[PDB]
């Protein structure tokens, strides 16, 4: 793979909370949407596997 996935995607929440100029920080709503999708997808994937075992019982 040449694609790097961040070990720490929480670096998107970094930055000083003090002396912030207005409009200094970029709007990263799309990044949060992407990370939410990954969490929903992985959890959805996980819920569709432990139910197959219930079927295969």
């Amino acid at each position: 793979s040449r694609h790097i996935e961040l070990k720490y995607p929480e670096v998107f929440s970094h930055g000083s909370p003090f002396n912030v100029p207005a409009g200094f920080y970029p709007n990263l709503d799309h990044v949060i949407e992407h990370y939410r999708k990954q969490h929903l997808e992985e959890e959805e994937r996980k819920a569709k596997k432990l139910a197959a075992a219930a079927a295969a019982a």
Partner: protein, 103 residues
Amino acid sequence: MASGYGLNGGPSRCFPFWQELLACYVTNSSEDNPDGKNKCIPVMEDYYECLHHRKEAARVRALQAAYREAEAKKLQENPPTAGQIRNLGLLNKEEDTKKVHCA
């Protein structure tokens, strides 16, 4: 710089440029398409430009040589003295300000 923490306790001046490059990579690069990250190239040059300033150093060099060679050649009538410049926008120095602004 990339951290988000500057010298006055406020945020680093190149942090918005770093967050856009990270945002661009995460939201364009993927396993399905290795080449989405080519969208990140202009975003990457800007982060380096806010860090080192080579392109803004190059523009000011060009314009500054162009500017001085024009003002040097340009006709000169009367130089506004430093005292006149110091009197710009004062309370009772209307004459000095008008001379400075040539209005």
